[PDB]
Amino acid sequence: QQGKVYETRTVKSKILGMERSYSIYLPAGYDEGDGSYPVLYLLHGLGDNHTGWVQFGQVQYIADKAIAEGKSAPMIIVMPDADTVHKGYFNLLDGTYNYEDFFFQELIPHIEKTYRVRAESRYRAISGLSMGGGGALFYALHYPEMFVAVAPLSAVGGAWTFDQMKNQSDLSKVSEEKKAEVLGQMDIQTILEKSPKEKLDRIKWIRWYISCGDDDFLSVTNCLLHNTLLQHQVGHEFRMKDGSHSWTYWRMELPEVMRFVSRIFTQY
Amino acid sequence: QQGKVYETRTVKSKILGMERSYSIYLPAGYDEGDGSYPVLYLLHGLGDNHTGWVQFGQVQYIADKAIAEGKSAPMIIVMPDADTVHKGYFNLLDGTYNYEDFFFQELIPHIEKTYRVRAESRYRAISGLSMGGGGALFYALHYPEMFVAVAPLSAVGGAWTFDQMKNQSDLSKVSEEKKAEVLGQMDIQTILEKSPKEKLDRIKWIRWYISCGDDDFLSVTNCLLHNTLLQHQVGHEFRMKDGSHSWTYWRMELPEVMRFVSRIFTQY
Amino acid sequence: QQGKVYETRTVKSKILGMERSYSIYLPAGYDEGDGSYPVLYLLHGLGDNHTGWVQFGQVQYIADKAIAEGKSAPMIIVMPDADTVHKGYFNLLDGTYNYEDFFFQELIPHIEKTYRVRAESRYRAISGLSMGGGGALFYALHYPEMFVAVAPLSAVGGAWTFDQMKNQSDLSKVSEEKKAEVLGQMDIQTILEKSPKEKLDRIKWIRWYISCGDDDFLSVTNCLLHNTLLQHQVGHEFRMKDGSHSWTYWRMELPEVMRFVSRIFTQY
Amino acid sequence: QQGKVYETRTVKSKILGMERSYSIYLPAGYDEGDGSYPVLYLLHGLGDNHTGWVQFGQVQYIADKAIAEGKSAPMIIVMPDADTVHKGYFNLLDGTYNYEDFFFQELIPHIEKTYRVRAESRYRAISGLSMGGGGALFYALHYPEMFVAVAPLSAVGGAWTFDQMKNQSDLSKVSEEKKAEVLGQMDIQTILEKSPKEKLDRIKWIRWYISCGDDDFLSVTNCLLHNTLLQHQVGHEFRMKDGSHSWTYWRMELPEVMRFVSRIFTQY
Amino acid sequence: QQGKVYETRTVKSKILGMERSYSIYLPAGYDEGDGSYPVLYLLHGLGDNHTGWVQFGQVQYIADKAIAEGKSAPMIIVMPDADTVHKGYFNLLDGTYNYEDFFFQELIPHIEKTYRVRAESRYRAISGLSMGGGGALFYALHYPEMFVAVAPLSAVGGAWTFDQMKNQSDLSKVSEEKKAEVLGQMDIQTILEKSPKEKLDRIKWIRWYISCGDDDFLSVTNCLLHNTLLQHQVGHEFRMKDGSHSWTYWRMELPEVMRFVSRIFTQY
Amino acid sequence: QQGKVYETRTVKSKILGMERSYSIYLPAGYDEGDGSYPVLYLLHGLGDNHTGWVQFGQVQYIADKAIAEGKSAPMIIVMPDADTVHKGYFNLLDGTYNYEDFFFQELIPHIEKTYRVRAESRYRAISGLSMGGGGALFYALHYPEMFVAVAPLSAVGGAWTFDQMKNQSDLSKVSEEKKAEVLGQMDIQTILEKSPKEKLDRIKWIRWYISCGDDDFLSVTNCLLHNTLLQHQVGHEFRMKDGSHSWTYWRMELPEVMRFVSRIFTQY
Amino acid sequence: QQGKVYETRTVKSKILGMERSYSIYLPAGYDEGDGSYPVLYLLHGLGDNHTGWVQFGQVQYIADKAIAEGKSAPMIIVMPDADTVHKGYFNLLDGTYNYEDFFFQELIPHIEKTYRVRAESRYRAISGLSMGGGGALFYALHYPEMFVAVAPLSAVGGAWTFDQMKNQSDLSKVSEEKKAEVLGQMDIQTILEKSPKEKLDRIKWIRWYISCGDDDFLSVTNCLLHNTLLQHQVGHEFRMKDGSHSWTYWRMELPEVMRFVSRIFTQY
Ligand SMILES: [Ca+2]
Ligand SMILES: [Ca+2]
Ligand SMILES: [Ca+2]
Ligand SMILES: [Ca+2]
Ligand SMILES: [Ca+2]
Ligand SMILES: [Ca+2]
Ligand SMILES: [Ca+2]
Known part of the structure; x- marks a missing residue:
């Protein structure tokens, strides 16, 4: 029980x-x-x-x-x-x-x-909300061989994530060539267009579940993500449900994420 | 009953x-x-x-x-x-x-x-699917004073609608200036930017419910619509649910549309 | 059915x-x-x-x-x-x-x-909301012999009602002496203190059900009404429930009002 | 109702x-x-x-x-x-x-x-049991343009049907050349191999639902029918359920046939 | 529990x-x-x-x-x-x-x-899927005295099984006569034709439950198996249900297999 | 309904x-x-x-x-x-x-x-209780060609029925040979032993449902009836349930009788 | 639990x-x-x-x-x-x-x-099926002081039980008279006719529940038992339900036996 x-x-x-x-x-x-x-x-x-x-x-x-x-x-x-x-x-x-x-x-x-x-x-999946939704998203895009299913919830984008990385770093020690390198590694369009084919094939193989509420300030970001993925032929489940950037939304989605990855774990 | x-x-x-x-x-x-x-x-x-x-x-x-x-x-x-x-x-x-x-x-x-x-x-609402979703959308953008609630389902866009109008018309008799005017009248961006404030205010007042399946070939069109509406401060309900361009989706949404417009008819 | x-x-x-x-x-x-x-x-x-x-x-x-x-x-x-x-x-x-x-x-x-x-x-009861709650209330205070049960919902008070009567009247035809008489007839405190015993006894005999949401702009008015009735030994049911000045509240209360007056009609 | x-x-x-x-x-x-x-x-x-x-x-x-x-x-x-x-x-x-x-x-x-x-x-479907299952089957193979969905239940085959046609006819008036002609028209293998592409495409377009109990003396006939249809690339639903050649089986299948053809009538 | x-x-x-x-x-x-x-x-x-x-x-x-x-x-x-x-x-x-x-x-x-x-x-039953369905089938045909109930799910046939045995054997060491011997032992018709009456009676005594989806690539194999068993007077339960060669099918069938063998274990 | x-x-x-x-x-x-x-x-x-x-x-x-x-x-x-x-x-x-x-x-x-x-x-069945149970029983034994299903409930036997016929007849006009003839026609043993093959075959073809409470004074009569019918190879449904000679018993059995004969009417 | x-x-x-x-x-x-x-x-x-x-x-x-x-x-x-x-x-x-x-x-x-x-x-009851139903029956007739409730299910009779005893005894050492004495001890009629009043009263005091399926080869034996008990004024519960000599019958009756003896253990 x-x-x-x-x-x-x-x-x-x-x-x-x-x-x-x-x-x-x-x-x-x-x-x-x-x-x-x-x-x-x-x-x-x-x-x-x-x-x-x-x-x-x-x-x-x-x-x-x-x-x-x-x-x-x-x-x-x-x-x-x-x-x-x-x-x-x-x-x-x-x-x-x-x-x-x-x-x-x-x-x-x-x-x-x-x-x-x-x-x-x-047998390994990853999910998260807000900052953690971007974490799940870019973890899987960086290392797609490590996950079978990925569920970003109300996910922040790459520019927000990269901006937060800069604000916590001592930029006096960071070269401009290095800022440009990570910037590309934290940009969805760059990853999807410039990754080697082996990496892109694995990204397409992953089972994606992307969910965001229609009243969330990130709803536009996540609609743009849906469009970008289809543009690059990355099939995925996309949901825009009623709701906001709230724990009501994330508690509603957790059992859906569990059912989603479980079907992948057990096969069907 | x-x-x-x-x-x-x-x-x-x-x-x-x-x-x-x-x-x-x-x-x-x-x-x-x-x-x-x-x-x-x-x-x-x-x-x-x-x-x-x-x-x-x-x-x-x-x-x-x-x-x-x-x-x-x-x-x-x-x-x-x-x-x-x-x-x-x-x-x-x-x-x-x-x-x-x-x-x-x-x-x-x-x-x-x-x-x-x-x-x-x-006490007047309008809804439709596919071609009729574009019908509902642009009927309301043209005459927002006529409706309290609008529910475009899996809706086609303005360019498709305008092209379909052209293939049904006698274009030998149609002037080049006439094509340009109606094109603008069937373009959401133009309507939202060039309408007088009384029309834009009424468009914002309407209760919109826009729903499209994530596997619909029109899912990108409707995500772009969500983004454009928010960009112009037109609040609305947006849903992207599992499903395709099918009567399974539209029969699923019909009672949701009925609940949505009924709540507006009865107030709450 | x-x-x-x-x-x-x-x-x-x-x-x-x-x-x-x-x-x-x-x-x-x-x-x-x-x-x-x-x-x-x-x-x-x-x-x-x-x-x-x-x-x-x-x-x-x-x-x-x-x-x-x-x-x-x-x-x-x-x-x-x-x-x-x-x-x-x-x-x-x-x-x-x-x-x-x-x-x-x-x-x-x-x-x-x-x-x-x-x-x-x-076999006669009266209920109403907002302006009609004040109507039901003062109809019963004016003619307590006509009703067995009274249910003012989210009711306006006498001062608001009287102000409304004045703004619709041609006051050029109204003496100040009449204004004083009717204002007293539209003040619960005056009615309860100056009514004869026979009338006051009937007001106490009526079964009252007074309900108003806690988020209603009239919540203070109705709390004051509750205190005034108890101050004058007029027993009544009082409810302050979650809710606002809305049809959600009044549709919730309608079957409660029906059950309340029905029990009085049938006896128990 | x-x-x-x-x-x-x-x-x-x-x-x-x-x-x-x-x-x-x-x-x-x-x-x-x-x-x-x-x-x-x-x-x-x-x-x-x-x-x-x-x-x-x-x-x-x-x-x-x-x-x-x-x-x-x-x-x-x-x-x-x-x-x-x-x-x-x-x-x-x-x-x-x-x-x-x-x-x-x-x-x-x-x-x-x-x-x-x-x-x-x-909006036209056909179904039947035993002799009527062979009836539904060959009506559709003879006139596939007339039906959208066909559901033979515990169906007899072509050889049994043609033998009964023979035994109900006065063969004193029947030439041997005609017997050979009808025989081919009542044989599933001949129809599928000798029909022109337009007729065969329509047979493949029909939605077939073939069901027979595993204890039915016709279970072998219907298993061979399943195999014949797949060998000619005629997609179909095939069910072999517990049961015999009985009205228990056919009353069980009638709502399944209704749901099957209903879905085709309404689309999905 | x-x-x-x-x-x-x-x-x-x-x-x-x-x-x-x-x-x-x-x-x-x-x-x-x-x-x-x-x-x-x-x-x-x-x-x-x-x-x-x-x-x-x-x-x-x-x-x-x-x-x-x-x-x-x-x-x-x-x-x-x-x-x-x-x-x-x-x-x-x-x-x-x-x-x-x-x-x-x-x-x-x-x-x-x-x-x-x-x-x-x-008190001993055996069941399996795909390769394991053929395993369960030929285990019971080889040693029918060992089982009371047998449930092949979406089972491969003897030719597939024997071909897999050859591809895993060092065929440089295998005589052509031995290749012929095993092939007959891994072909269902030969066992039923060549088994002594004592063995065939036990094969008939076993309670068989054979189930395969109608969209499985093995559906024809299993329909042929149904026909072969009936031709040899081996009574059995046969099910062809909606489904494919998938874990949805096998998880659906597992509780059915359990009920089937349990009834045999407990008697009824 | x-x-x-x-x-x-x-x-x-x-x-x-x-x-x-x-x-x-x-x-x-x-x-x-x-x-x-x-x-x-x-x-x-x-x-x-x-x-x-x-x-x-x-x-x-x-x-x-x-x-x-x-x-x-x-x-x-x-x-x-x-x-x-x-x-x-x-x-x-x-x-x-x-x-x-x-x-x-x-x-x-x-x-x-x-x-x-x-x-x-x-499409014709007959049932009854007590005196009417004997009525249904002997009606069907006399004219088995007239019924497909027969359901005697708490039925009296032939000796009781014959005694009631005698006590209502003016016996002064009745010969001793006539009394002996009817006694045999109202005796189940005689009917079953001496009816011609055609009648007896139809009696065996009839679907019988015989039910009586264990506390009924007729429970012995109906147990003897069960034994007599089996002795003459008349297969039948027999029920001895808790209950007495009461309308509680007969109202309990009426829907069982309806379901029993209904299955025979519709086939199964 | x-x-x-x-x-x-x-x-x-x-x-x-x-x-x-x-x-x-x-x-x-x-x-x-x-x-x-x-x-x-x-x-x-x-x-x-x-x-x-x-x-x-x-x-x-x-x-x-x-x-x-x-x-x-x-x-x-x-x-x-x-x-x-x-x-x-x-x-x-x-x-x-x-x-x-x-x-x-x-x-x-x-x-x-x-x-x-x-x-x-x-607080002691006894029940059993077939051979064990005869065991429960004669255990209680031999020692009625030992049980408050007895439930023979599909019970064999005394003649079968006595024949079973002989086929297991060394008949070379068994005299003809002892054969006669135990025969009477295994005959219900003899026990009921020859027991002293004290014993017969206790047999009548026991709560008996006798149940047998109508398709059981022992149904006649148990109908005769019902009649014999009533002939000797031994009240009892008698059930003849649909069913045969099978574990379906005995598993169905087990909770009925438990309910029956439980009510006697707890009183009511
Ligand atoms: Ca919303
Ligand atoms: Ca989808
Ligand atoms: Ca509140
Ligand atoms: Ca079967
Ligand atoms: Ca299928
Ligand atoms: Ca009883
Ligand atoms: Ca029976």
Whole structure:
């Protein structure tokens, strides 16, 4: 019936030189039997940390119910802290805070070693809201081989994300050639047009679920994303539902994201 | 519990020089008491006529159910024939077929004369699919004083509508200046930028519900419409749901349109 | 299961020198058998007429449902037109428009002659919203012998009502002595303190149901009314519920009003 | 809501030189409004007549329920008598009984003249059981332009049908060259291989629903039919469900046939 | 009430010279009381292993629900790994990998020794999908004394299975006479024609449940199988349902298989 | 959803020299369409007449519900008066009151002429309670060609029935040979042993449903009947349920009788 | 809430000189609190042992459900093994196997000492099927002081049981007279005619529930038993329901037996 949440566990990060927090939801029956589970990485927005999806997202109640009713197969849900020290998901421009490196090289392997996780891309999905929606989006565009399904909710765009990366970096140490390089790596149109074919094929292979409310200040950004993806022949699910930039919207979408990635995990 | 549909009645049109067909749904209990009802005009797509919303849209079953369940207040639904002689909702460029004039100067007054109708704009809404979605959209942008609520479904755009008008007109008799004027009258950007303030204010006052499936070949057109409307401060409901350019989508949306306009008719 | 509404019938009023509109709801099965029914008079607000409770209040659907479910006993509901010529329920100060006289001396006797009505005060109730809530309130304070139950919803007070009467009157024909007399007749404090015992006893005998939303601009007025009635030992039901000055509130309260007066009509 | 059945009406047949019986189901509300309906022709098996689908098939109860529940859109159901004089659906070899000619040249036009029928192939379907399943199958292969959807239930094959045509004919008048001609016209393999592309395209365009119980003595025949159709690239729905050659099976399949053809009539 | 799954246990195989994986479902309450259970052996398709029916088949959720609802009696479900080293269920022709020997001589005795199993054929069933459907089919035809119930889902035929056996064998070491011997043992018609009466009676005694979707590329194979079994007087349940070669089909069929074999386990 | 009952109609009997009463239930929708219905003859017990199954049996409510719910197909139910003048179903020994002759030669033809009845034995059933259970039983044993289904409820035996016939006859005119002849005609053992093969075969073909409460004083009689029928290879349904000789029992069994005969009427 | 079953426990029998098997169902919540429970002894048929009611009867699921739903009060269910060494419930005629002595002198006291059992006859019931129905019947006729309620299901008679005893006894050592004496002890008529008043009163005091399917080859035996009991004024519940000599019948009757004996255990 009931899964459980741990909020206080940390990962020893060599890349960030500190203990990094995360929250984790383990499904009901994790403690019986010996099997392993697929994983959904679930990213918070600006101003929250790893407790955001727990306290505001109510992940425990919502995941318990979805799994118990059969709307979702059992899965582990990992909620990283991208708030402490610096807020955001990507490597800072001054080289002092390689958060994206930490996520892929330390957090994911730590989860797969510490919990009974099916450690394959076909069993790995990522979702997030606002800042975390852009995090999910560009994580998958940068490393499409690492995910089978991606669900950006009310996602911020690349220009906002890049602007936030600059405002947290010491730009005295950043060359102008470097600013231009990342700028392109944080631009959807550039990634889709200039990536090698192998990378583009994998991006098309990913199952995308993009959802944003019609009253959200990001509704135009996400409509432009829909159009850009179709222009580049990246099939995806797109939803514009009634709602705003609010936790009412994100709690409504969480069981939909769970059903979406679960069907991909189990096949159909 | 059951309304009824008349498919075979006609209006004598002086503007078009002929009897013109329409279908009409009368709600349950229209035949008892003496009261009047608000009206939803419901427009078909290319290749269908006034029987399209009856046979494919299943308006009778769907409207009966929504009203009986209290999801919609009772209303009359009028489905014009915009297929016979020429296909489309607008005045042809050669002056020989003024369908939009017919709709406003003859069809609406005929309905209000023949049936127990609340003959005010606050009780008049319009909706349609595909070609009829473009019909509903531009009818309201042309005559916003005539409608309180507008629901374009999977709507075609102005350029397609204008091109389809051209292929039905005698262009040997059409001046080059005439093409340029009507092109602007069928372009949303031009209407929103060049209309007098009284018309723009009324366009902003109208309650808009714009819905299109994410797999529709028109999904990009309707995302651009959402963006243009917000760019001009025209608030509206926007929905992009799962679905394609199909009667599954349009039958799904019909009770949503009925709930939407009913709430405006009854106030809330 | 379904009652019916007539909107187009009139009373020939000698007092107002014209045919006066009303709407009337007749319960299901009024047309079978020969029996008679109690009556709820249901008053509209400023700017609406006798169609307001029909189109916005959805009286037919709401009354049909309440009676069919047994939440209310069958009753006739009469909705007068207090909008045409002058807006409001009371005699104008210049003597040219004695609407209150019309209501009691012409409308009520016309209803009781024309329909199968139990024509006794124990079977007569009155309710209304906003301007009509003040109408119901002061109709009952003026003629407490005529009603068994009174339900002012989101009601305006006496000072607002009197100001309205003045702005529609030719005050060149009004003495200041008359202004003083009518203002006192439109002040609840004055009525309760200067009424004879027989009249005050009848006011206390009436069953009052006073309801107003907490977000309504009239919430303070109605809280003050609650305190004044208790201060004068006039027992009553008082409700302050979530809601505003809206048809959502008044449609929510209509079946509560029907249940309230029905229990009084049937005894319990 | 209840439709109704007429069992005693006839069509004057010049081709057969007699009054010919049929039963017809008219949907609920056929008597209200003026609209027209699509038609399902529903054929009986050997030994029954036009009353078989009424009394054993319980068409009235089953169709009423399917339509009232929204599982099927409203439709007219016509059940011909192919039992009186000679049993079977096809022209006898001695030229004395051209039943197939009667069905297409007299029965269908009579129905479309007498009832409010949408008289187009897109609104015409045919289904039947046992002998009538072979009837539906070969009517559609002979005249594929006449049907949009075909549903043979527990259908006999061509060899059985042709053998019965032989046993009902006076072969003293039949040449051997004619027997070979009809034999090919009643063989699915010959029709699919020898039809011109225009006819074959229409056969492939038809929506087929072929269903047979796994305990039916005809299960092998219908499995071979499935294999033959796929080998000629005729897409179709095939169902082999638990059950035998019984009215339990056919009453179970009737609402499935209704939903199947209804979806085609309304589009989706 | 939740059962549990162990995925990581193994049986030490002398025949295969290695530890061999399997997954096992134990029903709710296996850990209370001391009783024993019947067993369903459940085989995966090509490219999956013992985790396929766990992760994609969702065996734990589906079995929990079927048993808790009383659709199935409690049973143990064993999912062998027929993927590691070599893919497939049968003894390779070069003598290097006797998987079928392993299954009957080592896996089944290990299960009956290790778990509380009713170790009799009346309590032993086998089912599988695709490659595993052919495995279940020919396992029972080779050793019909070992099973009371057999359920091939979307099963490959003997020619496909034998061809896969050749492609995994070192054919440089295989005699042409041996190639002929195995081929006859992997062809359904030969077994039914060449088995002694004792063996054929047991094949007829087994309760067979054969199910395949009508859109599966194996639908023709399975229709031919249905016809072959009836030609040999082997009664069986045959289902051709809507569906494709997909996990939607196999998850739909799993509770049906459980109910089918459970009724045989419990008698009725 | 509503059938109706006529209690006051009569059939003019030449055989009995009087107008004879019956009650008849006509199913819902009898008055729409033109079709015909099967018939259940339903016989009362001692001391009641043709109103017994109406007032005590509540035939209208019970039949309406069974038919509306689909537990029974629509049917006509005929309830004869076998109480007026003499009580009982059989020809009196003195030749003065040939009630059985009346039932078969006058009542059945009158019903088939007067109502829209399918006038064949396959559409004719008979049931009854107590005295009428013996009536149904021996009517069918005497004339098995007239019924397809027979349902004796709490039935009296032949010895009781014969004794009642004697006590109502003037035995002064009856020979001892005549008493012996009728005794044998009213003895189930004699009927089953001595009826010709054709009669006995038809008795075995009839579908029998025999039901009696375990607390009924007739429970022994009906257990002996079950045993006698099996001894003579007359297959039948037998029910001994909790209950007594009461209208609670017969109202419980009426919808079971309707479902039993309905399945026979419609086939399955 | 689930009870549990032990299948592997044994009673140390000095009478039979060996460990004797039984199964036992303990109700949900047996492990909470310290109270005691009534007991139903539940006997298997010929060829099964103490696992029959567990595996085929599904006693755990059925008892769990009946108790959880409040259809039965909690009770312990004991299922003896009457199959090992010799099949049957009674003392063999050669004196070498006194199974009835074992049941009463060893099994019942063992159950009452080992489990929390209300060890009084008012809390002791017995039921069984086929051979075990005859076991329950004659156990109670032999020792009526030991049971408050007895439920023979599809019961064999005394002549069959006695014949079963002879075919297992060493007839070379068995005298003709002892053969006659036990024959009378296994004949219902003899027991009922020759028992003293004290014993007959207790047999009449027992609450009997006798049930058998109408298609069972033992239906005649049980109808004769019903008649014999009534002939001797032994009131009892008798049921003849649709069904055969099958586990469908016995699983259907098990919760009815539980409800029946539970009401007697709890009083009403
Ligand atoms: Ca919105
Ligand atoms: Ca989509
Ligand atoms: Ca509030
Ligand atoms: Ca079958
Ligand atoms: Ca299909
Ligand atoms: Ca009883
Ligand atoms: Ca039976």
